[PDB]
Amino acid sequence: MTVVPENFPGLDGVVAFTTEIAEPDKDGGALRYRGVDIEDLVSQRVTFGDVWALLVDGNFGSGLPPAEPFPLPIHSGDVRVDVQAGLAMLAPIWGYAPLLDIDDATARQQLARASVMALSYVAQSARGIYQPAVPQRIIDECSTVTAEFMTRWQGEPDPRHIEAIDAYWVSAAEHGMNASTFTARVIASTGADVAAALSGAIGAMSGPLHGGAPARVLPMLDEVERAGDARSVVKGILDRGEKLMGFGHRVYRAEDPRARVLRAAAERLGAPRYEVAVAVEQAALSELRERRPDRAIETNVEFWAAVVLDFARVPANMMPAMFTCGRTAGWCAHILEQKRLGKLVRPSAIYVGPGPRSPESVDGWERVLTT
Amino acid sequence: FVPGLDGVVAFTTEIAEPDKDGGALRYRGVDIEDLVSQRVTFGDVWALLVDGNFGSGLPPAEPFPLPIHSGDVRVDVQAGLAMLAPIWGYAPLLDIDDATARQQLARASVMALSYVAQSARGIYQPAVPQRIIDECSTVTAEFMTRWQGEPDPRHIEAIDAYWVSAAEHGMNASTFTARVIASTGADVAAALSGAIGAMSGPLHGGAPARVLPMLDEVERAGDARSVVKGILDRGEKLMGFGHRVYRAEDPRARVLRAAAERLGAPRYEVAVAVEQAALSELRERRPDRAIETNVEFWAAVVLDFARVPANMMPAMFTCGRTAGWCAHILEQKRLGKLVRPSAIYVGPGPRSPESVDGWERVLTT
């Protein structure tokens, strides 16, 4: 009794795990997957299926396989809901046992099998029920998992658009301990099947406060494109008391490395929005830093994620699903690490509510009808 | 450093207090013994935990035939609840008010119970007509009528007593998962769906269906004392007994055992004999640690009394736990703080991609 807190809500700063998966070296200004810099993987054109194996296994040589033909069973109108409920439904039909009752090779195989199915579900969900499915023979001639995704969704995709997705998916594959990765590790720590953990991680990812979803910079980029001057549009947005999307406080020590590789991809692949995007980035950084010289302002990677995704004909409402597709690498790597660690994540809570009390001394007891 | 957040305090709740040292469980200060003794139905205990007071219990479920038929009752509700958001227009928690979130939690809760009853009834049987479900006066009787059509009134009191005892039990992994998702601002249907996922884990606690083979051995053997010896002699774990949770007896097992006797469960006497035989064995072979009966033992007897099969008991546990989940989700919204821990890198240092094992088997696009 008389339990009392002392200048203590949440787990901010509390270390819950140690990991060998990746290091978001924010003070050093670099992001590394198993010690491999994110800039060397994107610039040397390593496909997402191979980076998936690198994050999960710790080394190359066992990338993602082609997804088996499984037409999407859920058409809810929300791509997130379609993949969240769909992945949870894989366990009974595929005979997924709990994590406690399977070895590591089976869990790694079940994670790889579910990750490619999530990519297929997102491709089918975005194509919509108002379109006949892409034939399997056309999907089969694709050589990479990223090209398989674009073919299942678009049918005849531009190879430049496939190259753009590989740049984004790799750069968004894993970025430390967030709410969606924490949810995946907590569910997996109970010994549940890997399908339940990925399903719960998608639900946590849909939260607006999770962060990382591509920014709403397309309408602003539409104004500068036809108005001409980027400095006048950005200045007009701030002078009218509006918010600049895609720019704010710093995440890394300086420029975000994921933002540098996405901008480099937009230029290398010849994105029609690139020249306007650079002018908007230069004007936004200059105007925001000039107005508040004592505050750090950097370009969010969501700014260039929106440009790269829109270049690949990705609609704005589908961009959050594109983020979930890439994050399956980090979620799967963290689920396997939690399986080997083998300990339930269970925090505690201090009770500060009412003390012992009879039922009759509670508000609305007269409303209660006893059996 | 020790991983697992063991002992780390994450929140300060006013919902319920599992008094471990005192051996009591209270919902907003009200003992579960009084709620079960005075026959408070589950729909009212839901209101007590979520709102903090009686008055606005759970309403009858709207007609919504289950769209998911996966063969697992847990998967049917985990997927079913997540699909409620687009059809019902569930906005993110960040963009709705408190009274709307409370109604959204109450709406999805009675829908989760409706989904379990339909899933357990199975697709190979015609649905119970709505006019029969409309005859019930409590939510618990509504669940059994939609599931069994003509349920035994004693089985309704058994489920009603079990659901009250399992409604809330502090910061467990399933309740922690619901708060973590809700802290991101996601809709209440996604927080409940994720909580069911962490719920199906075997290392979460509450696996009552696993004790059934032991009770079946005693039925044909005749002497439970020698059967408990046989399980321990072969080296496998004894089901439903072991480590102490509260100071001594679990309050939920105390309530469930009393409910099994008063309602005249046919398998009560064998369960009491198995409980006596199992307690004396583990206390004799390991006399240096405190041994108590786990709640999953008497929870299985009570659930088996109400004709709940083995592959449905986990879904019955999520049904009652919706009260605790919704109460903590609503508390998490008012808190308005994103919960996330940190991790330390202990992996390899900066290296080139060509130095990684298997770079020869990678094709550059």
UniProtKB/TrEMBL annotation, chain A:
Any single Gene Ontology cellular-component annotation: cytosol
Pathway: Carbohydrate metabolism; tricarboxylic acid cycle; isocitrate from oxaloacetate: step 1/2
Gene Ontology terms describing biological process: carbohydrate metabolic process; tricarboxylic acid cycle
EC number(s) given by UniProt: 2.3.3.16
Pfam families (alphabetical): Citrate_synt
Highest rank taxon of the organism: Bacteria
An example Gene Ontology molecular-function term: citrate synthase activity
EC main group: transferase
PROSITE patterns named in the record: CITRATE_SYNTHASE
Keyword Acyltransferase: yes
Coiled coil stretches, renumbered: none
Keyword field: Acyltransferase, Allosteric enzyme, Transferase, Tricarboxylic acid cycle
NCBIfam families per the UniProt record, alphabetical: PRK12350.1
Stated family: Belongs to the citrate synthase family.
Protein name: Putative citrate synthase 2
Species for this entry: Mycobacterium tuberculosis
